Amino acid sequence: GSHMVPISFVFNRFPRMVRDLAKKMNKEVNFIMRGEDTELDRTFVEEIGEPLLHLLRNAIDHGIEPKEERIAKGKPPIGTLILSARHEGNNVVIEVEDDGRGIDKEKIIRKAIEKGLIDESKAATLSDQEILNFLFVPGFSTKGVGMDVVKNVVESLNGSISIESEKDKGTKVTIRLPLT
């Protein structure tokens, strides 16, 4: 830990950015930030901004549903978006979690069958992790930003990123950064 700085140097600029993205996409979202005092290498702080912003925009765009939809679906009217940082052994863990509609895994499945990557029979055997990983295959999604770009930036930092989601329950993206 030579050049450690609180992750607040990258976090504090998000509340305003989230609020304006919500207004633009007509989404009502309660934004929560946890662990802004978590220390990490300054190089990361200066490079993780683009990535996080993209995960936050994804949550607001594809995740949280318009209030009128959440209401019709029987969910808390206002959406919740949580950006947090914490320590797990010699790793700094940053997470972006929403209680939105969740990643549409069938949509992914159909796209993979369409690109000839898998056939029907095979698609019925895939695990959620295998499905969600298609989101990291370059060129898989239609646009440059994207999950492709988030994984590459994160890994150029010797970091790791994972995803998990449950239909109508929400989505959570996890980024692990190394202790320097």
Ligand X SMILES: Nc1ncnc2c1ncn2[C@@H]1O[C@H](COP(=O)(O)OP(=O)(O)NP(=O)(O)O)[C@@H](O)[C@H]1O
Binding residues for ligand X, per CB under 6 A? 58-59, 62-63, 98, 100-104, 107, 135, 141-148, 171
148 neighbors 138 (Cβ within 8 angstroms) = yes
Distance CA 156, CA 150 (A): 10
Choice between 24 and 34, CB closer to a second copy: 34
With respect to ligand X, which residue has the nearer C-beta, 75 or 101?
101
- Asked if 36 touches a second copy (CB under 8 A), the answer is yes
> Residue 171 interacts with Mn ion (CB under 5 A)?
no
89 backbone dihedrals φ, ψ, rounded to 5°: 65, -135
Binding mask 122-141 for a second copy (x = CB under 8 A): ----------------xx--
Least gap, CB of 107 to ligand X (angstroms): 6
**Distance of alpha carbon 38 from alpha carbon 123, whole angstroms:** 41
What phi and psi values does residue 48 have, to the nearest 5 degrees? -80, -5
Binding of residue 58 to Mn ion (CB under 5 A): yes
Instruction: Report the C-alpha gap between 13 and 180 in whole angstroms.
Output: 24
Judge whether 64 and 81 are in contact, CB under 8 Å.
yes
Judged by beta carbon distances under 5 to 8 A according to partner kind, the member of Mn ion, a second copy, ligand X, none in contact with residue 47 is: a second copy
Using the contact rule CB under 8 A, the part of the chain among 16-24, 38-46, 102-110, 124-132 near a second copy is 38-46
Give the number of residues in contact with Mn ion, rule: CB under 5 A: 1
Query: Is the CB of residue 41 less than 8 Å from the CB of residue 9?
Result: no
Is the CB of 28 or the CB of 128 nearer to a second copy?
28
Phi, psi of 153, rounded to the nearest 5 degrees:
-65, -50
How far apart, in whole angstroms, are the C-alpha atoms of residue 22 and residue 118?
36
Q: Does 155 bind a second copy (CB under 8 A)?
A: yes
105: closest CA among 169, 174, 21? 169
Instruction: List interacting residues with a second copy (CB under 8 A).
Output: 3, 30, 32-37, 42-43, 46-47, 74-80, 84, 138-139, 144, 152-153, 155-158
Residues that bind Mn ion (CB under 5 A): 58
